[PDB]
Amino acid sequence: DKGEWKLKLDASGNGQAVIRFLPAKTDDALPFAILVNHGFKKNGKWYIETCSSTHGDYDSCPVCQYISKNDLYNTNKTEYSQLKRKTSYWANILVVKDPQAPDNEGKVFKYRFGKKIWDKINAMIAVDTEMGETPVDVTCPWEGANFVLKVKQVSGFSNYDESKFLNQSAIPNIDDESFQKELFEQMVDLSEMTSKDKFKSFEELNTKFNQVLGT
Ligand SMILES: [Zn+2]
C-alpha cells in the first residue's frame, strides 16, 4: 500500500520468491537508481541521512567532511566503518511468485537492494565475450530473465547466496500492448529517489551530525 515490495520471511528467517527486474520506464531513464547514505548511532542518537555524494557532491555532506578531515580511514578504522557511506539500489520489479503473499504476484512495485544482488545482475551482462560468453540484460521484457530471491539466516544475518537468475524468458503477455502499457504504467520514476529534495542542506545535516557526535 506504499508501492514498495518486500520479501516476507518466516519464523526460521527463510524466504524465497521469483521477481523480474524491469527495464527503464522511459527511453531517457535508467532501470536502476543508485543511492548513497550514512547510518550510525552515537551518544544514544541516530544519524540516518542521504549523502550528497550520490550526485558527486562530497562537500555538502558533514559526515564525509568529518571522515576526510580527520583521516578516519587511517587514524581510526573502527570509526570509519561505522560512519562510511553506504550504497544501495532501487529498481522497478514485476513479482512473479510470492508464496508468502500470493496477492503480490503479477503486480509492479519498487524494490531496494544491495551490492550482493546488484553484482548478480551485473555478472549477467559483464561477461567474457572473448571466450564466447553471451551477455544477458536481465531487465529486458523479451530476453531478460526471472530472478529467484532466496534468503537464509547465516551467522545472524540474512544471506542471499542462493539467489540466482533462471534461464532467459520473455514476460508472458508482453507482446499484448494493453498489458505492456499497464506494466510501464505501474513503474515508478526511479530518478525520483535521487532528486534534489531528497537531500537536506549542509547546515541542517551538520547541525544534526554535531548533536549526534556531541561535537
Ligand atoms: Zn557523505
Automatic annotation (TrEMBL):
Annotated binding of Zn(2+), by residue: H38, C51, C61, C64
GO molecular function: metal ion binding; single-stranded DNA binding
One Gene Ontology biological process: bidirectional double-stranded viral DNA replication
Domain Bacteriophage T4 Gp32 single-stranded DNA-binding: 13-212
Record carries keyword Glycosyltransferase: no
Keyword terms, alphabetized: DNA damage, DNA recombination, DNA repair, DNA replication, DNA-binding, Metal-binding, Repressor, Viral DNA replication, Zinc
Keyword 4Fe-4S annotated: no
Free-text note regarding domains: The acidic C-terminus is involved in modulating the ssDNA binding properties. The N-terminus LAST motif is involved in the cooperative binding of the protein to single-stranded nucleic acids. The acidic C-terminus is involved in modulating the ssDNA binding properties. The N-terminus LAST motif is involved in the cooperative binding of the protein to ssDNA.
Function (record text): Single-stranded DNA-binding protein that participates in viral DNA replication, recombination, and repair. Coats the lagging-strand ssDNA as the replication fork advances. Stimulates the activities of viral DNA polymerase and the replicative helicase, probably via its interaction with the helicase assembly factor. Together with the replicative helicase and the helicase assembly factor, promotes pairing of two homologous DNA molecules containing complementary single-stranded regions and mediates homologous DNA strand exchange. Promotes also the formation of joint molecules.
Quaternary structure annotation from Swiss-Prot or TrEMBL: Homodimer in the absence of DNA, monomer when binding DNA. Interacts with the DNA helicase assembly protein; a ternary complex between the helicase assembly protein, the single-stranded DNA-binding protein and ssDNA is an obligatory intermediate in the helicase loading mechanism. Part of the replicase complex that includes the DNA polymerase, the polymerase clamp, the clamp loader complex, the single-stranded DNA binding protein, the primase, the replicative helicase and the helicase assembly factor. Interacts (via C-terminus) with the viral SF1 dDA helicase.
Family statement: Belongs to the Tequatrovirus single-stranded DNA-binding protein family.
Protein name in the entry: Single-stranded DNA-binding protein
Annotated organism of origin: Escherichia phage RB69
